[PDB]
Amino acid sequence: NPFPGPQECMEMMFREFGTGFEQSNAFIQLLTTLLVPPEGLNDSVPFPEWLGSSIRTLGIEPYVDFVFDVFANRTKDISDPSQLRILRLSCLDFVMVCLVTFNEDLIVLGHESNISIDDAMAATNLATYVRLHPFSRVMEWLFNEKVITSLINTIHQDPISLGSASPDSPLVVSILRAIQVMIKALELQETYLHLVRPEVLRYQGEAGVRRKPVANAAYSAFEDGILSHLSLVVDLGKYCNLGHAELTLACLKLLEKISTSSRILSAWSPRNKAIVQLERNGEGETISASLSASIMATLDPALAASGENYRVKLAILDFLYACLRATPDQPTIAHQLLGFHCELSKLGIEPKGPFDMQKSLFHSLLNVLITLTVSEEEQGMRGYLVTLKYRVLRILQLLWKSPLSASLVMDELRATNFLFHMLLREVQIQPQLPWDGQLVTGCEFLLSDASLAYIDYLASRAAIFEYIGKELCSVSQNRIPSIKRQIFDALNGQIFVPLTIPSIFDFFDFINTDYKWEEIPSPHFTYLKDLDLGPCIGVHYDIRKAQEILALKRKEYEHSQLATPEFLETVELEEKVLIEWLTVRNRANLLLTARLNLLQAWANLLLVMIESNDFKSTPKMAFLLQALQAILPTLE
């Protein structure tokens, strides 16, 4: 009643506060600040449940509705680009503050066990939370064409502006916020369409609510509204040459999620559109060149896990892995970025191209891999180097297994002596060399993160052995002794360019039963002994399945009213021991399967070597006896 009905006065005041930019931005900031709870950034949604109960209003929805209507329609009356950028940034921040304040796991567990197991008392609380929280309205607005059009217009800008702009420029911050909102929407679209739409529809059907739809029924998902924009990927790729770590990581994650989808790649390749869009003015070439220049940039030894360069490298590697693992038979953008001529159900190399001159992304990866040393002195056997090489080897294996990109890759590898570089980069493992300053025999080893690096190193050795065996089989079937001599010399322990290297029998040091990975010390467990891991269990024992059971048991014991305060610490320490027991069992299973895979790879390599061997046997009798001596204790 601002001094005329309230439904009219409120909209009149909102429209009055919409004229201009200063007052609009100030109101948006005020609303964003008010939406923050007093405890800071989970229940008790930050607003009174009786907000607007007197008048026939939907609560706090009108505010978000007006904000979205403004951001969608009145963005053309702003001449000053700075004001428009500030308004878009404020709207994106408001949307993010509204989305981040939504419970996902809570609603999932509710819809799962509340009505099916728990009573119907708390159901009303979750219902009111889902009905009053503005997340549903934001998601509904996200399916509008105006919103995505404004977003892609804001993200589509000239490169000169971003180049001459400052890292703290509002344009970069707005683009980052928009990418984050898009990521959150792509993550929560399924949860919404599953546990919001039906409940809201049922509530609207039962009770009396007057709401105006703002979503498009045709857009069954968020990808339907964005699959019509081809310049988005081009802009995301061009924005990688700016140097901004956060923006680069966001763009890489967005491209990875896009390549991971299915409808987008079904619409693109039902000839194709992306390959021709990225080959308009040589965008792929410059993108590959920028990626190569980036991965070649060194890292900061002190800021191992904080070096933005290493983070960008890992993001690019994850993107390539996700793009190659998805739909390997049909080519993708990864093949074009590597320097291949992506043709319909066929690949090829062009003359004088970047991949022909051995200057491309794949060759850059090969170089940075062969010029990488993991053997250190101060710590020795670092972890992030191991992770990097493991990712590189996974990408190489994904490229090799694909028969569409196997022959050319093997040719390019054998034409540069990659196996020789790998062997020269090999390092022997012993129980004395610690992992990141920590010894293996220590009990904390199974609890520390060194297990991941150990599994990665085992997988790397297995992949190297498999590649060596495949190359040996190829050279044998090709009936050419020009390379067989060098292969045997490398296996004999000599190199003629003589440089010596440890033989294959030297690397047979990963089979050791002294650690007793199978045996586990079982504590007394005077209580909770009957709690098994039935619902916990692909050997993967979930911890929540036992956490809920032990919590229910503790609640029952407390309700029994028999020395509940004293014996609580016993149950607490038993749970703290059981969680580490489960983690140790999982790590032991992982180590066991890794050792099994490595042993299988080594056995296959040895079989391929023994079978395809025309060299005399009397000289190799020494190696035969050595292998027999080495396997004797293993069999025993």
């Binding site: 051995q358 170089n367 540069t416 002596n417 020789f420 570089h421 020269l424 190199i495 360019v497 440089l499």
Partner: peptide, 9 residues
């Protein structure tokens, strides 16, 4: 063609 890929330590 192989400026640095050579095995010349």
């Amino acid at each position: 063609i192989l400026p640095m890929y050579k095995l010349s330590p």
